[PDB]
């Protein structure tokens, strides 16, 4: 466990392009890693915090390059 | 060798005007700015000797 | 080449608190500075002619 | 990992009584661990904290229950 928080991120994925997407993903986030390195703005989600991680994507106190790529991939465009 | 050079430029006042979602137009925020604001940690370490 | 530097540091003070038998430890002792105090002795060493 | 710091306590064993002993533990603890519940006091120990655990038997942020069965363990009388 990350042993301080988690910060759960909710994004809600829309229609970019053309039969196209940004993908949603529920995702969680060890606090202090959260705290140090997140991306999300315009991302279109609903964060809380939590004693426990509260989604099945869990980060804890250490990931940062791949949480950090992560974050970034909220933005993700599929086809 | 001047090939390719530098330059700073500004906003055409078509664009500038509207900006964000004027007259219709989209996918064209503004840019901002924030402030941060981390701290760091000192600690004292001892040290002491005998006769 | 910057592959091995050099540093002091000093001592934390959990260690330092406790430093020879205290709260029940036990060898960990404080180092200590002695003057030490020898002697150098020199002789006359004579000289001489003669005509 | 406790993501922290560890403190070490190394106790040095000695001999109680006459064919006995009270053998010598090398132990590390997560320092959220060790301030909460540490026995140690005439233990014949000594302590120094350190990022990454120092000795091999190694308690990390939660075991609690099962450190603070070992550390008044610290006075387990052997033959």
Chains 1, 4 share one sequence.
Do not use: C
Request: hydrophobic share 35%; glycine share 8%.
């Amino acid at each position: 466990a990350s042993a301080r928080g988690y910060v759960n991120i909710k994004t809600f994925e829309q229609k970019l392009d053309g039969n196209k997407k940004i993908e949603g993903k529920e995702v969680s986030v060890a606090f202090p890693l959260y705290s140090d390195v997140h991306k999300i703005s315009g991302a279109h989600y609903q964060t809380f915090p939590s004693e426990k991680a509260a989604y099945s994507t869990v980060y804890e106190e250490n990931q940062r390059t791949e949480w950090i790529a992560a974050n970034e991939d909220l933005w993700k465009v599929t086809g | 060798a001047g090939a390719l050079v530098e330059i700073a430029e500004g906003m055409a006042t078509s664009i500038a005007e509207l900006q964000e979602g004027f007259n219709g137009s989209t996918d064209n925020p503004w840019n901002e700015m924030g402030f941060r604001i981390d701290k760091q940690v000192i600690e004292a370490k001892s040290r002491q000797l005998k006769a």
